[PDB]
Design a protein around this nucleic acid. Structure first.
Ligand SMILES: [K+]
Ligand SMILES: [K+]
Ligand SMILES: [K+]
Ligand SMILES: [Mn+2]
Ligand SMILES: [Mn+2]
Length: 134
RNA sequence: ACAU
DNA sequence: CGATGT
């Protein structure tokens, strides 16, 4: 119904899918960029969306913030809930980096706790998420 | 079909 | 038009 403005919004950007992947997190209210991941040479849209949420969780936990996280990715929200990124991307030398980060994100989820609500950004009602790359 |  | 996902 209503946007929870006191929140963090995350999004992925890519050049190709699979292709170069990056992500960032922004204050939903102001658009201030709070974190930005250095581009990863080969990844998928969904792996980046997943890494972005998990980074948000870690960022908010480190700062003792109870703000929710918005993502527009049905897929990544489910992968975080499951603590398992069910990506189809081949594992090889050129995808080793993204797969390491994904494995490490799953590992963090399996060894830490959080109460952070992970919320679907309702693009059809609200427009593009504030972290979008345009 | 829906989410990207 | 292509791809990643539930
Ligand atoms: K964009
Ligand atoms: K979108
Ligand atoms: K499809
Ligand atoms: Mn997105
Ligand atoms: Mn976007």
């Amino acid at each position: 119904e209503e946007i929870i403005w006191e929140s963090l919004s995350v999004d992925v950007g890519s050049q190709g899918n699979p292709g170069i992947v990056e992500y960032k997190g922004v204050d939903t209210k102001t658009g201030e960029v709070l974190f930005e991941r250095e581009p990863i040479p080969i990844g998928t849209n969904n792996m980046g969306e997943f890494l972005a949420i998990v980074h948000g969780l870690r960022y908010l936990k480190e700062r003792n913030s109870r703000k929710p996280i918005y993502s527009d990715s049905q897929t990544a929200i489910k992968w975080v809930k499951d603590k398992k990124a069910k990506s189809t991307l081949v594992r090889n030398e050129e995808t080793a980096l993204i797969w390491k980060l994904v494995d490490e994100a799953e590992e963090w989820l399996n060894t830490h706790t959080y109460e952070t609500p992970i919320l679907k950004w309702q693009t059809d009602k609200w427009g593009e998420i504030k972290a979008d790359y345009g």
